[PDB]
Amino acid sequence: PKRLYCKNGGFFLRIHPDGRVDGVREKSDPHIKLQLQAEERGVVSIKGVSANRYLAMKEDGRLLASKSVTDECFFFERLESNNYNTYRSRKYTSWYVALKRTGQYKLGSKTGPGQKAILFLPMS
Numbered sequence: 001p002k003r004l005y006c007k008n009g010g011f012f013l014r015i016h017p018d019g020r021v022d023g024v025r026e027k028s029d030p031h032i033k034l035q036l037q038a039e040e041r042g043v044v045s046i047k048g049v050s051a052n053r054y055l056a057m058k059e060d061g062r063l064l065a066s067k068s069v070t071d072e073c074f075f076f077e078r079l080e081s082n083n084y085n086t087y088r089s090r091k092y093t094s095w096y097v098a099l100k101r102t103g104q105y106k107l108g109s110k111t112g113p114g115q116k117a118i119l120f121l122p123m124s
């Protein structure tokens with residue numbers, strides 16, 4: 001039951017109950033409560049507690065939430081400097097979960113390992 005705080009702008013990842021994924025700056029938003037469950041060492045599924053959906057990365061680079069687990073719902077969790085974590089798609093292996101400075105999700109296809117947009121600070 002954490003909250004993923006993105007370094008690019010200062011937005012918390014959010015998972016809405018309709019499938020839409022985005023960021024907010026309000027820390028009391030109930031849709032920013034997440035549950036990361038490891039499938040093994042280094043691989044996690046990220047689910048939005050309220051919405052009961054998993055974060056998924058689609059083939060066009062989009063981020064959305066799906067009610068059931070698909071091979072687009074898994075990500076390698078890797079620790080970066082200063083305790084920030086990054087989540088890279090186990091399917092689209094060079095694409096990273098990320099948020100643009102405006103709060104809207106960045107397409108995984110436009111991401112890369114040195115961007116600030118992929119860095120998340122996990123908070124209870």
Ligand SMILES: O=C(O)C1=C[C@H](O)[C@@H](OS(=O)(=O)O)[C@H](O[C@H]2[C@H](O)[C@@H](NS(=O)(=O)O)[C@@H](O[C@H]3[C@H](O)[C@@H](OS(=O)(=O)O)[C@H](O[C@H]4[C@H](O)[C@@H](NS(=O)(=O)O)[C@@H](O)O[C@@H]4COS(=O)(=O)O)O[C@H]3C(=O)O)O[C@@H]2COS(=O)(=O)O)O1
Nearest residue numbers: 008009098099100101102106110111112114115116117118
């Ligand atoms: O593909 C594009 O759409 C795209 C690519 C190019 O990079 C650039 O287009 S170009 O024609 O000018 O070459 C333009 O880049 C965008 C970039 O896509 C945006 N990233 S997003 O917010 O995720 O959408 C954004 O970048 C800003 C972000 O905060 C961040 O980008 S990223 O790392 O997450 O990809 C990045 O942050 C800088 C930071 O500001 C620096 N801090 S300092 O105070 O200035 O010293 C420093 O710490 O470095 C980081 C990361 O290093 S980097 O920037 O050198 O890679 O950059 C931010 C920024 O540049 O605004 O905006 C750029 C520019 O967009 S603009 O609207 O044209 O201004 O689009």
